[PDB]
Tab-separated table of all heavy atoms in Angstrom:
chain	number	residue	atom	x	y	z
B	558	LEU	N	0.690	5.762	-1.180
B	558	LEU	CA	1.805	5.100	-0.546
B	558	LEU	C	2.654	4.523	-1.695
B	558	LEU	O	2.097	3.913	-2.647
B	558	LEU	CB	1.305	3.966	0.396
B	558	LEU	CG	0.386	4.467	1.542
B	558	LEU	CD1	-1.081	4.281	1.190
B	558	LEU	CD2	0.760	3.751	2.833
B	559	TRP	N	3.965	4.698	-1.588
B	559	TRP	CA	4.909	4.195	-2.604
B	559	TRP	C	5.962	3.347	-1.860
B	559	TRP	O	6.707	3.874	-1.014
B	559	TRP	CB	5.559	5.372	-3.368
B	559	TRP	CG	6.364	4.956	-4.543
B	559	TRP	CD1	6.382	3.723	-5.152
B	559	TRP	CD2	7.285	5.781	-5.266
B	559	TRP	NE1	7.255	3.738	-6.228
B	559	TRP	CE2	7.838	4.987	-6.316
B	559	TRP	CE3	7.711	7.113	-5.139
B	559	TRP	CZ2	8.789	5.470	-7.203
B	559	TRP	CZ3	8.685	7.610	-6.051
B	559	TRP	CH2	9.217	6.788	-7.051
B	560	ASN	N	6.033	2.056	-2.235
B	560	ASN	CA	6.999	1.156	-1.643
B	560	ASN	C	8.336	1.261	-2.408
B	560	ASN	O	8.488	0.654	-3.454
B	560	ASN	CB	6.471	-0.305	-1.644
B	560	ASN	CG	7.484	-1.264	-1.016
B	560	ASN	OD1	8.489	-0.802	-0.379
B	560	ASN	ND2	7.253	-2.583	-1.185
B	561	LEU	N	9.289	2.018	-1.852
B	561	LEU	CA	10.608	2.235	-2.458
B	561	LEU	C	11.658	1.215	-1.984
B	561	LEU	O	12.885	1.417	-2.188
B	561	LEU	CB	11.093	3.668	-2.172
B	561	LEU	CG	10.334	4.784	-2.903
B	561	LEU	CD1	10.688	6.124	-2.290
B	561	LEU	CD2	10.790	4.713	-4.350
B	562	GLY	N	11.169	0.160	-1.332
B	562	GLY	CA	12.002	-0.964	-0.916
B	562	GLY	C	12.016	-2.088	-1.947
B	562	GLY	O	11.352	-2.025	-3.059
B	563	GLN	N	12.731	-3.147	-1.552
B	563	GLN	CA	13.062	-4.278	-2.433
B	563	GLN	C	12.136	-5.453	-2.137
B	563	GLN	O	12.152	-6.474	-2.857
B	563	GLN	CB	14.526	-4.751	-2.201
B	563	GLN	CG	15.557	-3.610	-2.347
B	563	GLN	CD	15.335	-2.918	-3.665
B	563	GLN	OE1	15.242	-3.590	-4.709
B	563	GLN	NE2	15.153	-1.587	-3.628
B	564	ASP	N	11.364	-5.305	-1.057
B	564	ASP	CA	10.508	-6.372	-0.523
B	564	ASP	C	9.008	-6.009	-0.651
B	564	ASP	O	8.678	-4.925	-1.159
B	564	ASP	CB	10.874	-6.637	0.948
B	564	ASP	CG	10.541	-5.443	1.865
B	564	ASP	OD1	10.440	-4.291	1.347
B	564	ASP	OD2	10.371	-5.572	3.110
B	565	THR	N	8.099	-6.919	-0.263
B	565	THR	CA	6.675	-6.635	-0.312
B	565	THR	C	6.221	-6.049	1.028
B	565	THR	O	6.663	-6.514	2.085
B	565	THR	CB	5.893	-7.931	-0.623
B	565	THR	OG1	6.347	-8.436	-1.892
B	565	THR	CG2	4.412	-7.673	-0.781
B	566	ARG	N	5.367	-5.022	0.967
B	566	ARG	CA	4.802	-4.374	2.159
B	566	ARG	C	3.270	-4.351	2.103
B	566	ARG	O	2.672	-3.850	1.124
B	566	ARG	CB	5.386	-2.930	2.327
B	566	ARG	CG	6.867	-2.935	2.627
B	566	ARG	CD	7.137	-3.294	4.080
B	566	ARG	NE	8.547	-3.613	4.269
B	566	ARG	CZ	9.115	-3.868	5.453
B	566	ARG	NH1	8.372	-3.849	6.569
B	566	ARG	NH2	10.431	-4.118	5.512
B	567	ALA	N	2.638	-4.853	3.155
B	567	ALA	CA	1.187	-4.710	3.275
B	567	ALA	C	0.825	-3.301	3.773
B	567	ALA	O	1.413	-2.782	4.752
B	567	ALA	CB	0.626	-5.779	4.214
B	568	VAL	N	-0.167	-2.693	3.133
B	568	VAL	CA	-0.615	-1.376	3.550
B	568	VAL	C	-0.985	-1.381	5.066
B	568	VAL	O	-0.702	-0.398	5.775
B	568	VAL	CB	-1.758	-0.837	2.644
B	568	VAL	CG1	-2.334	0.433	3.187
B	568	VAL	CG2	-1.227	-0.591	1.223
B	569	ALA	N	-1.586	-2.480	5.545
B	569	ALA	CA	-2.041	-2.591	6.948
B	569	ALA	C	-0.895	-2.541	7.957
B	569	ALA	O	-1.077	-2.178	9.141
B	569	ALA	CB	-2.846	-3.856	7.140
B	570	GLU	N	0.302	-2.872	7.499
B	570	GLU	CA	1.433	-2.891	8.408
B	570	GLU	C	2.287	-1.614	8.328
B	570	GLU	O	3.311	-1.512	8.991
B	570	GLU	CB	2.231	-4.153	8.111
B	570	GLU	CG	1.346	-5.416	8.206
B	570	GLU	CD	1.883	-6.590	7.401
B	570	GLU	OE1	3.097	-6.899	7.495
B	570	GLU	OE2	1.529	-7.421	7.806
B	571	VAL	N	1.873	-0.644	7.490
B	571	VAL	CA	2.617	0.610	7.407
B	571	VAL	C	2.230	1.416	8.626
B	571	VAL	O	1.047	1.641	8.877
B	571	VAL	CB	2.331	1.389	6.079
B	571	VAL	CG1	3.057	2.789	6.080
B	571	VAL	CG2	2.772	0.546	4.875
B	572	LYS	N	3.223	1.818	9.414
B	572	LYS	CA	2.979	2.653	10.602
B	572	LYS	C	2.758	4.103	10.158
B	572	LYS	O	3.677	4.742	9.584
B	572	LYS	CB	4.158	2.608	11.584
B	572	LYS	CG	4.437	1.223	12.242
B	572	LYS	CD	5.667	1.314	13.136
B	572	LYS	CE	6.327	-0.055	13.298
B	572	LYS	NZ	7.711	0.038	13.889
B	573	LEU	N	1.550	4.616	10.399
B	573	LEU	CA	1.179	5.975	9.984
B	573	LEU	C	0.657	6.732	11.206
B	573	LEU	O	0.004	6.096	12.065
B	573	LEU	CB	-0.006	5.888	9.024
B	573	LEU	CG	0.259	5.209	7.676
B	573	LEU	CD1	-1.034	5.116	6.905
B	573	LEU	CD2	1.254	6.001	6.829
B	574	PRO	N	0.876	8.044	11.280
B	574	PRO	CA	0.360	8.866	12.409
B	574	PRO	C	-1.118	9.255	12.285
B	574	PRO	O	-1.591	10.159	12.990
B	574	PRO	CB	1.245	10.103	12.366
B	574	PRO	CG	1.641	10.235	10.876
B	574	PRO	CD	1.685	8.845	10.331
B	575	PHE	N	-1.835	8.613	11.373
B	575	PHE	CA	-3.252	8.815	11.199
B	575	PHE	C	-3.822	7.449	10.775
B	575	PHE	O	-3.074	6.512	10.502
B	575	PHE	CB	-3.517	9.877	10.093
B	575	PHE	CG	-2.794	9.561	8.814
B	575	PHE	CD1	-3.412	8.746	7.839
B	575	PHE	CD2	-1.477	10.063	8.580
B	575	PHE	CE1	-2.747	8.413	6.671
B	575	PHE	CE2	-0.805	9.727	7.383
B	575	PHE	CZ	-1.445	8.895	6.438
B	576	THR	N	-5.146	7.328	10.694
B	576	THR	CA	-5.749	6.050	10.289
B	576	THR	C	-5.760	6.001	8.756
B	576	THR	O	-6.314	6.887	8.119
B	576	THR	CB	-7.202	5.966	10.855
B	576	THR	OG1	-7.117	5.859	12.288
B	576	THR	CG2	-7.954	4.683	10.390
B	577	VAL	N	-5.200	4.945	8.189
B	577	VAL	CA	-5.173	4.845	6.733
B	577	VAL	C	-6.606	4.734	6.169
B	577	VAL	O	-7.421	3.969	6.725
B	577	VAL	CB	-4.244	3.689	6.232
B	577	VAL	CG1	-4.884	2.284	6.454
B	577	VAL	CG2	-3.911	3.901	4.785
B	578	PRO	N	-6.933	5.503	5.108
B	578	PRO	CA	-8.184	5.278	4.344
B	578	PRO	C	-8.280	3.849	3.827
B	578	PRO	O	-7.252	3.206	3.583
B	578	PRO	CB	-8.109	6.289	3.194
B	578	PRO	CG	-7.165	7.362	3.693
B	578	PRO	CD	-6.171	6.657	4.608
B	579	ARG	N	-9.505	3.330	3.705
B	579	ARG	CA	-9.720	1.884	3.377
B	579	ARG	C	-9.950	1.559	1.889
B	579	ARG	O	-9.718	0.393	1.477
B	579	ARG	CB	-10.881	1.268	4.225
B	579	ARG	CG	-10.685	1.330	5.755
B	579	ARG	CD	-11.949	0.989	6.575
B	579	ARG	NE	-12.323	1.746	7.772
B	579	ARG	CZ	-13.271	1.331	8.603
B	579	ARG	NH1	-13.999	0.265	8.300
B	579	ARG	NH2	-13.489	1.987	9.742
B	580	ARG	N	-10.439	2.529	1.106
B	580	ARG	CA	-10.933	2.226	-0.253
B	580	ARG	C	-9.770	2.378	-1.226
B	580	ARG	O	-9.129	3.437	-1.250
B	580	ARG	CB	-12.126	3.136	-0.644
B	580	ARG	CG	-12.642	2.980	-2.084
B	580	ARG	CD	-13.947	3.745	-2.404
B	580	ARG	NE	-13.867	5.196	-2.171
B	580	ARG	CZ	-13.830	6.120	-3.136
B	580	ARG	NH1	-14.205	5.807	-4.036
B	580	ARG	NH2	-13.758	7.404	-2.812
B	581	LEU	N	-9.482	1.331	-2.005
B	581	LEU	CA	-8.379	1.317	-2.979
B	581	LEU	C	-8.863	1.990	-4.271
B	581	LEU	O	-9.769	1.460	-4.930
B	581	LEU	CB	-7.915	-0.138	-3.242
B	581	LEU	CG	-6.716	-0.417	-4.157
B	581	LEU	CD1	-6.363	-1.925	-4.170
B	581	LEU	CD2	-7.055	0.047	-5.555
B	582	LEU	N	-8.289	3.152	-4.617
B	582	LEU	CA	-8.681	3.951	-5.753
B	582	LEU	C	-7.878	3.605	-7.013
B	582	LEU	O	-8.411	3.605	-8.131
B	582	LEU	CB	-8.608	5.466	-5.456
B	582	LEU	CG	-9.521	5.916	-4.273
B	582	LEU	CD1	-9.457	7.392	-4.129
B	582	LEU	CD2	-11.003	5.451	-4.379
B	583	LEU	N	-6.575	3.354	-6.847
B	583	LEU	CA	-5.717	2.980	-7.984
B	583	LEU	C	-4.434	2.343	-7.475
B	583	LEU	O	-3.754	2.910	-6.613
B	583	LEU	CB	-5.356	4.198	-8.847
B	583	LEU	CG	-4.407	3.980	-10.047
B	583	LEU	CD1	-5.064	3.015	-11.028
B	583	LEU	CD2	-4.080	5.244	-10.795
B	584	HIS	N	-4.103	1.198	-8.051
B	584	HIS	CA	-2.888	0.477	-7.677
B	584	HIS	C	-2.058	0.474	-8.961
B	584	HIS	O	-2.603	0.126	-10.037
B	584	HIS	CB	-3.244	-0.968	-7.271
B	584	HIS	CG	-2.095	-1.710	-6.683
B	584	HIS	ND1	-0.950	-2.013	-7.399
B	584	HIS	CD2	-1.890	-2.155	-5.418
B	584	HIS	CE1	-0.107	-2.653	-6.603
B	584	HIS	NE2	-0.648	-2.739	-5.391
B	585	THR	N	-0.773	0.829	-8.895
B	585	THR	CA	0.037	0.944	-10.144
B	585	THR	C	0.270	-0.352	-10.911
B	585	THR	O	0.622	-0.310	-12.116
B	585	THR	CB	1.420	1.648	-9.896
B	585	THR	OG1	2.112	0.945	-8.832
B	585	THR	CG2	1.125	3.140	-9.445
B	586	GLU	N	0.026	-1.467	-10.210
B	586	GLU	CA	0.075	-2.799	-10.924
B	586	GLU	C	-1.274	-3.482	-10.962
B	586	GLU	O	-1.359	-4.688	-11.213
B	586	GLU	CB	1.184	-3.724	-10.379
B	586	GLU	CG	2.568	-3.074	-10.410
B	586	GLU	CD	2.981	-2.717	-11.835
B	586	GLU	OE1	2.683	-3.551	-12.758
B	586	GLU	OE2	3.621	-1.649	-12.091
B	587	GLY	N	-2.315	-2.706	-10.675
B	587	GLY	CA	-3.708	-3.184	-10.802
B	587	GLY	C	-4.083	-4.331	-9.857
B	587	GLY	O	-5.009	-5.102	-10.155
B	588	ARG	N	-3.397	-4.455	-8.724
B	588	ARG	CA	-3.743	-5.481	-7.750
B	588	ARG	C	-5.044	-5.143	-7.067
B	588	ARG	O	-5.426	-3.958	-6.974
B	588	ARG	CB	-2.635	-5.716	-6.736
B	588	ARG	CG	-1.277	-5.755	-7.387
B	588	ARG	CD	-0.212	-6.480	-6.558
B	588	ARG	NE	1.116	-6.411	-7.169
B	588	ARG	CZ	1.557	-7.214	-8.135
B	588	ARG	NH1	0.764	-8.165	-8.617
B	588	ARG	NH2	2.792	-7.049	-8.613
B	589	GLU	N	-5.705	-6.202	-6.577
B	589	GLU	CA	-7.013	-6.094	-5.929
B	589	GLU	C	-6.827	-5.822	-4.435
B	589	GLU	O	-7.676	-5.173	-3.810
B	589	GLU	CB	-7.836	-7.375	-6.128
B	589	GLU	CG	-8.008	-7.817	-7.580
B	589	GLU	CD	-8.656	-9.198	-7.695
B	589	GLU	OE1	-8.603	-9.990	-6.715
B	589	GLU	OE2	-9.219	-9.482	-8.772
B	590	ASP	N	-5.740	-6.329	-3.850
B	590	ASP	CA	-5.499	-6.166	-2.405
B	590	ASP	C	-4.538	-4.975	-2.082
B	590	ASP	O	-3.742	-4.529	-2.941
B	590	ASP	CB	-4.929	-7.468	-1.810
B	590	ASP	CG	-5.829	-8.699	-2.072
B	590	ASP	OD1	-7.079	-8.550	-2.189
B	590	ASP	OD2	-5.367	-9.862	-2.177
B	591	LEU	N	-4.617	-4.472	-0.859
B	591	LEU	CA	-3.741	-3.397	-0.406
B	591	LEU	C	-2.351	-3.936	-0.019
B	591	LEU	O	-1.973	-3.981	1.166
B	591	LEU	CB	-4.416	-2.631	0.757
B	591	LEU	CG	-5.688	-1.939	0.255
B	591	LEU	CD1	-6.460	-1.296	1.394
B	591	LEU	CD2	-5.245	-0.894	-0.699
B	592	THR	N	-1.608	-4.388	-1.026
B	592	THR	CA	-0.269	-4.828	-0.796
B	592	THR	C	0.583	-4.242	-1.906
B	592	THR	O	0.154	-4.090	-3.071
B	592	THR	CB	-0.203	-6.368	-0.758
B	592	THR	OG1	1.138	-6.782	-0.428
B	592	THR	CG2	-0.534	-6.990	-2.141
B	593	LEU	N	1.811	-3.924	-1.523
B	593	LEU	CA	2.764	-3.275	-2.413
B	593	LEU	C	3.980	-4.137	-2.643
B	593	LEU	O	4.876	-4.202	-1.753
B	593	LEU	CB	3.172	-1.905	-1.852
B	593	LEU	CG	2.064	-0.869	-1.696
B	593	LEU	CD1	2.611	0.378	-1.055
B	593	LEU	CD2	1.431	-0.578	-3.088
B	594	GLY	N	4.089	-4.697	-3.861
B	594	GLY	CA	5.334	-5.256	-4.348
B	594	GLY	C	6.408	-4.171	-4.395
B	594	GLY	O	6.098	-2.964	-4.329
B	595	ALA	N	7.660	-4.606	-4.520
B	595	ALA	CA	8.809	-3.708	-4.631
B	595	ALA	C	8.512	-2.623	-5.706
B	595	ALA	O	8.229	-2.946	-6.837
B	595	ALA	CB	10.065	-4.531	-4.997
């Protein structure tokens, strides 16, 4: 998932047509939680 917006998005609130996988494999800013800064 890539947040191309200007705001913060939680992975849990992204509307997807399938169930999102739970295990965080790599975050581009090394965050521990499933949240995406701009």
Side-chain angles (χ1 to χ4, degrees):
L558 300 98
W559 189 13
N560 180 12
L561 290 167
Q563 305 308 310
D564 66 338
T565 300
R566 294 283 166 175
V568 172
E570 305 156 47
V571 175
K572 295 177 205 166
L573 294 176
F575 52 89
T576 292
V577 74
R579 301 168 221 191
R580 175 172 58 108
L581 184 175
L582 300 184
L583 177 62
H584 189 296
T585 54
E586 305 299 321
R588 317 201 184 277
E589 306 172 338
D590 304 331
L591 295 174
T592 184
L593 298 176

